[PDB]
Write a protein that holds these residues in place. Structure first.
Motif, mmCIF file in Angstrom:
data_model
loop_
_atom_site.group_PDB
_atom_site.id
_atom_site.type_symbol
_atom_site.label_atom_id
_atom_site.label_comp_id
_atom_site.label_asym_id
_atom_site.label_seq_id
_atom_site.Cartn_x
_atom_site.Cartn_y
_atom_site.Cartn_z
ATOM 1 N N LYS A 9 2.568 8.851 -7.480
ATOM 2 C CA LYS A 9 1.173 8.827 -7.086
ATOM 3 C C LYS A 9 1.032 9.291 -5.651
ATOM 4 C CE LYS A 9 -1.500 5.783 -9.724
ATOM 5 N NZ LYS A 9 -2.736 5.970 -10.525
ATOM 6 N N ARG A 10 -0.187 9.721 -5.338
ATOM 7 C CA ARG A 10 -0.547 10.190 -4.016
ATOM 8 C C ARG A 10 -0.372 9.088 -2.991
ATOM 9 N NH1 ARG A 10 -4.940 11.064 -0.588
ATOM 10 N NH2 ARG A 10 -6.140 9.495 -1.770
ATOM 11 N N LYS A 11 0.455 9.358 -1.991
ATOM 12 C CA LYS A 11 0.714 8.450 -0.874
ATOM 13 C C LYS A 11 1.380 7.156 -1.319
ATOM 14 C CE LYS A 11 -2.710 8.651 2.355
ATOM 15 N NZ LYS A 11 -2.628 9.768 3.330
ATOM 16 N N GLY A 12 2.039 7.192 -2.478
ATOM 17 C CA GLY A 12 2.882 6.102 -2.934
ATOM 18 C C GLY A 12 4.247 6.636 -3.330
ATOM 19 N N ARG A 13 5.103 5.718 -3.762
ATOM 20 C CA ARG A 13 6.480 6.073 -4.090
ATOM 21 C C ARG A 13 6.866 5.641 -5.504
ATOM 22 N NH1 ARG A 13 5.087 9.097 -0.765
ATOM 23 N NH2 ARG A 13 6.107 9.658 1.205
ATOM 24 N N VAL A 14 5.873 5.387 -6.357
ATOM 25 C CA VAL A 14 6.089 5.220 -7.780
ATOM 26 C C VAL A 14 5.045 6.025 -8.541
ATOM 27 C CG1 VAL A 14 7.222 2.937 -7.593
ATOM 28 C CG2 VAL A 14 4.717 3.133 -7.703
ATOM 29 N N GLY A 15 5.358 6.316 -9.809
ATOM 30 C CA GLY A 15 4.374 6.820 -10.747
ATOM 31 C C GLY A 15 3.442 5.727 -11.275
ATOM 32 N N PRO A 16 2.598 6.115 -12.238
ATOM 33 C CA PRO A 16 1.607 5.160 -12.776
ATOM 34 C C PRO A 16 2.228 3.981 -13.521
ATOM 35 C CG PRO A 16 0.969 7.451 -13.263
ATOM 36 C CD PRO A 16 2.364 7.502 -12.689
ATOM 37 N N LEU A 17 3.271 4.210 -14.310
ATOM 38 C CA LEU A 17 3.886 3.102 -15.030
ATOM 39 C C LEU A 17 4.358 2.016 -14.077
ATOM 40 C CD1 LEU A 17 4.602 1.770 -17.600
ATOM 41 C CD2 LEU A 17 6.713 3.125 -17.586
ATOM 42 N N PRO B 255 0.814 -1.223 0.000
ATOM 43 C CA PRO B 255 0.000 0.000 0.000
ATOM 44 C C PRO B 255 0.840 1.263 0.000
ATOM 45 C CG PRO B 255 -0.953 -1.608 1.450
ATOM 46 C CD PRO B 255 0.321 -2.205 0.982
ATOM 47 N N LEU B 256 1.993 1.256 0.669
ATOM 48 C CA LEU B 256 2.841 2.440 0.720
ATOM 49 C C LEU B 256 3.775 2.557 -0.482
ATOM 50 C CD1 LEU B 256 1.677 2.132 3.679
ATOM 51 C CD2 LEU B 256 3.783 3.143 4.504
ATOM 52 N N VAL B 257 3.903 1.508 -1.315
ATOM 53 C CA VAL B 257 4.563 1.667 -2.618
ATOM 54 C C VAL B 257 3.592 2.240 -3.622
ATOM 55 C CG1 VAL B 257 5.809 0.524 -4.526
ATOM 56 C CG2 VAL B 257 6.167 -0.248 -2.192
ATOM 57 N N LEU B 258 2.428 1.607 -3.731
ATOM 58 C CA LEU B 258 1.493 1.945 -4.792
ATOM 59 C C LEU B 258 0.631 3.163 -4.456
ATOM 60 C CD1 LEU B 258 0.481 -1.789 -5.583
ATOM 61 C CD2 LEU B 258 2.269 -0.423 -6.576
ATOM 62 N N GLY B 259 0.316 3.389 -3.182
ATOM 63 C CA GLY B 259 -0.715 4.337 -2.832
ATOM 64 C C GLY B 259 -2.114 3.804 -3.118
ATOM 65 N N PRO B 260 -3.117 4.381 -2.451
ATOM 66 C CA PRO B 260 -4.455 3.759 -2.423
ATOM 67 C C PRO B 260 -5.083 3.501 -3.781
ATOM 68 C CG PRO B 260 -4.309 5.615 -0.884
ATOM 69 C CD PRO B 260 -3.086 5.669 -1.737
ATOM 70 N N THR B 261 -4.955 4.430 -4.727
ATOM 71 C CA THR B 261 -5.647 4.291 -6.001
ATOM 72 C C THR B 261 -5.155 3.050 -6.743
ATOM 73 O OG1 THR B 261 -6.028 6.673 -6.173
ATOM 74 C CG2 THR B 261 -6.066 5.459 -8.178
ATOM 75 N N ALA B 262 -3.846 2.989 -7.004
ATOM 76 C CA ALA B 262 -3.267 1.818 -7.646
ATOM 77 C C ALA B 262 -3.428 0.570 -6.789
ATOM 78 C CB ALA B 262 -1.803 2.074 -7.944
ATOM 79 N N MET B 263 -3.420 0.709 -5.467
ATOM 80 C CA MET B 263 -3.578 -0.478 -4.631
ATOM 81 C C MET B 263 -4.916 -1.153 -4.896
ATOM 82 S SD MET B 263 -1.903 -2.297 -2.524
ATOM 83 C CE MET B 263 -2.215 -3.639 -1.377
#
Ligand SMILES: CC(=O)N[C@@H]1[C@@H](O)[C@H](O)[C@@H](CO)O[C@H]1O
Ligand SMILES: CC(=O)N[C@@H]1[C@@H](O)[C@H](O)[C@@H](CO)O[C@H]1O
Ligand SMILES: OC[C@H]1O[C@@H](O)[C@@H](O)[C@@H](O)[C@@H]1O
Ligand SMILES: [Ca+2]
Lengths: 577, 57
Positions: free
Chosen positions: A486-494, A298-306
């Motif tokens: 991304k918001r509340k994550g540590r990667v972009g969308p790709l 969850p902290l890599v992806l952030g909520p949306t991608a998660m």
């Protein structure tokens, strides 16, 4: 291979009954997109001079690193919402999932060059060339050494080259246990029926176990301190010694295994060694899945991608491919952006610890001796909990301890890990940035301005087009980490797509996933839900105050810390049959 | 391939007069699966791979 097993194999064989090699070790990576080689079969882009990729010269990986990754390291931006332990878990996790063999320097005899000493480009070497006016390597006839990853079908260029995963793709703690049967038994305490893993016999860490020593012919660890003669450590994965921070996490789980087997023997005294080992291994494996999917991802992806890429678990699905994709081996290297230039070590009170509280990473690589002779793993583990991770930012991508001075102490020159990353994606025939964007359902920019928009940073976009000519040619690691987080994550969308896709498949396609019906009882699964990394630290170290959940967000002492008293221990009563 | 340092303790157990013979036999089966069949095969491998084996006859 049966059909009523209850424990995993060591190699991963027979997880998918319909196809028992899926996810098993020492097999080729699955490809999510067809390979892209200079000659359509095996030559990596960059190999032949003047041979363009999609109409453009191939950029020297080191030049891309120099112009795009390099930044003043004392200007690094601490991450207010992640600990360094967030970086260290990603490295340790990745060593559960994938390891790509390369050939030995001693295979150089008679045949090809020693890739470690020569800059000659012939098999199996693919050395990185030095741009003019490099800040560090001022002789353009020099090079950064590089061995091509081994081909998975050695032979006659008829099939497209692919690479080998030497590990079980499954989140099964193979980093601890081995992905091969002889290693796995070498890792075991075979002198009794207690189910333990072997431990060091010459040293302990304040009465607590250290990893056993490995026996390597060219042991890099011995070279980091000539007088100390402390060799590398033996673990499930060959890299456990690369950094004492990593060694510390390997040693944590080693003790947790033995502590678990000890409880399980008190609870069920008739269980024999094999059964103790397998049952502790099973728990340790779920702990890694739980920490990974509940706390870390969850902290890599952030909520949306998660939510998009990792919906709520249903059950096991034997039609999903659990294999590691080739691209993930490179994309999951996003974490090099989180790495601090120092190893931080702290005392009882989370205060700087002498001898050396702030050691440049380039005096810490393979420094097995600092674990054994400079205070064990407690000071390292406190440093990881109470120090911020570095924040990835578009003009502070990666620190020079890994870009100028990687393995400086054990090689003829410091390597450049970002540059290695880009050379490695070329070695592996990975398609460029836009092709992964397409795969992920994401707009593909073609112009500097459109790249500007995707990155919300026109200046980075210009620098990327200067190096690469077209967004199509941007190497996956470089473009992936260039994207805004991304918001509340540590990667972009790709990278969120690639990374999250990979882990969904590893969960949905794992027959022994800890939440799947039959793996654990209903009660065992309610006990396991309690476990946490801070608790594991409490049970196996001299540390009595630890990070509060979520450990990967917590990062300032004393604000984000609690006494170990606070934390429910794991309750193994449900194992009492 | 190589002999591991912690496997030296296994040798101490094979050479322990009062050590459970069932335990010596599991250790001998472990070493057999590695191509080391007699005590002297075990020692000699240990020695070949960089360990001091004085203390073992
Ligand atoms: C540069 C450095 O720290 N070298 C160390 C030395 O200080 C230490 O006393 C020794 C342990 O015997 O290992 C080596
Ligand atoms: C009941 C269920 O989940 N079935 C799915 C199937 O629809 C899907 O095509 C496949 C791979 O995605 O995995 C399985
Ligand atoms: O047999 C005695 C030995 O037991 C074990 C270790 O704790 C050693 O330090 C000790 O000398
Ligand atoms: Ca694994």
């Amino acid at each position: 291979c049966p059909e009523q097993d209850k424990y995993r194999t060591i190699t991963g064989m027979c997880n998918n009954r319909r196809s028992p090699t899926l996810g098993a070790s020492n097999r080729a990576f699955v490809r999510w997109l067809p390979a892209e080689y200079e000659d359509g079969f095996s030559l990596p882009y960059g190999w032949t001079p003047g041979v363009k990729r999609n109409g453009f010269p191939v950029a020297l990986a080191r030049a891309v690193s120099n112009e795009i990754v390099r930044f003043p390291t004392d200007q690094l931006t601490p991450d207010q919402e992640r600990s360094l332990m967030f970086m260290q878990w990603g490295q340790l996790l990745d060593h559960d999932l994938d390891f790509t063999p390369e050939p030995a320097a001693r295979a150089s005899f008679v045949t090809g060059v020693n890739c470690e000493t020569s800059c000659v480009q012939q098999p199996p070497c693919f050395p990185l060339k030095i741009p003019p006016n490099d800040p560090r390597i001022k002789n353009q006839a020099d090079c950064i050494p590089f061995f091509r990853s081994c081909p998975a079908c050695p032979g006659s260029n008829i099939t497209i080259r692919n690479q080998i995963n030497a590990l079980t793709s499954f989140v099964d703690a193979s980093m601890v246990y081995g992905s091969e049967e002889p290693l796995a038994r070498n890792l075991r305490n075979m002198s009794n029926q207690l189910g333990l893993l072997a431990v060091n016999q010459r040293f302990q860490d304040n009465g607590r176990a250290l990893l056993p020593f490995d026996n390597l012919h060219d042991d890099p660890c011995l070279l980091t301190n000539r007088s100390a003669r402390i060799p590398c450590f033996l673990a499930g994965d060959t890299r456990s010694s690369e950094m004492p921070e990593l060694t510390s996490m390997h040693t944590l789980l080693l003790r947790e295994h033995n502590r678990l087997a000890t409880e399980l023997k008190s609870l069920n005294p008739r269980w024999d060694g094999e059964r103790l080992y397998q049952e502790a291994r099973k728990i340790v494996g779920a702990m890694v899945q739980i920490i990974t999917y509940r706390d870390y991802l969850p902290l890599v992806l952030g909520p949306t991608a998660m939510r998009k890429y990792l919906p709520t678990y249903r059950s096991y699905n034997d039609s999903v491919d659990p294999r590691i994709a080739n691209v993930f081996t490179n994309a999951f290297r996003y974490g090099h952006t989180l790495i601090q230039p120092f190893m931080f070590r702290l005392d009882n009170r989370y205060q700087p610890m002498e001898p050396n509280p702030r050691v440049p990473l380039s005096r810490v690589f393979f420094a097995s001796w600092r674990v054994v002779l400079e205070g064990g793993i407690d000071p390292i583990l406190r440093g990881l909990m109470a120090t911020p991770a570095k924040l990835n930012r578009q003009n502070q991508i990666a620190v020079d301890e890994i870009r100028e001075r990687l393995f400086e102490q054990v090689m003829r020159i410091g390597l450049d890990l970002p540059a290695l990353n880009m050379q490695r994606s070329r070695d592996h025939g990975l398609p460029g940035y836009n092709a992964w964007r397409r795969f992920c359902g994401l707009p593909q920019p073609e112009t500097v301005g459109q790249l500007g928009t995707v990155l919300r940073n026109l200046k980075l976009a210009r620098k990327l087009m200067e190096q690469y000519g077209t967004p199509n040619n941007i190497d996956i690691w470089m473009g992936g980490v260039s994207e805004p987080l991304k918001r509340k994550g540590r990667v972009g969308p790709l990278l969120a797509c690639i990374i999250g896709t990979q882990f969904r498949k590893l969960r949905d396609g794992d027959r022994f996933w800890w939440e799947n019906e039959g793996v654990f009882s209903m009660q065992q699964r309610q006990a396991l839900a309690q476990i946490s990394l801070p608790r594991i630290i409490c049970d196996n170290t001299g540390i009595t105050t630890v990070s509060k959940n979520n450990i990967f967000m917590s990062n300032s002492y004393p604000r984000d810390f609690v006494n170990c008293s606070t934390l429910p221990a794991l309750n193994l009563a449900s194992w009492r049959e | 391939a190589n002999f591991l340092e912690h496997e030296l303790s296994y040798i101490d157990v094979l050479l322990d007069k009062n050590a459970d013979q069932a335990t010596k036999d599991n250790l001998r089966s472990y070493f057999a699966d590695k191509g080391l069949h007699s005590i002297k095969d075990i020692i000699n491998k240990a020695k070949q791979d960089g360990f001091d084996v004085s203390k073992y006859e």
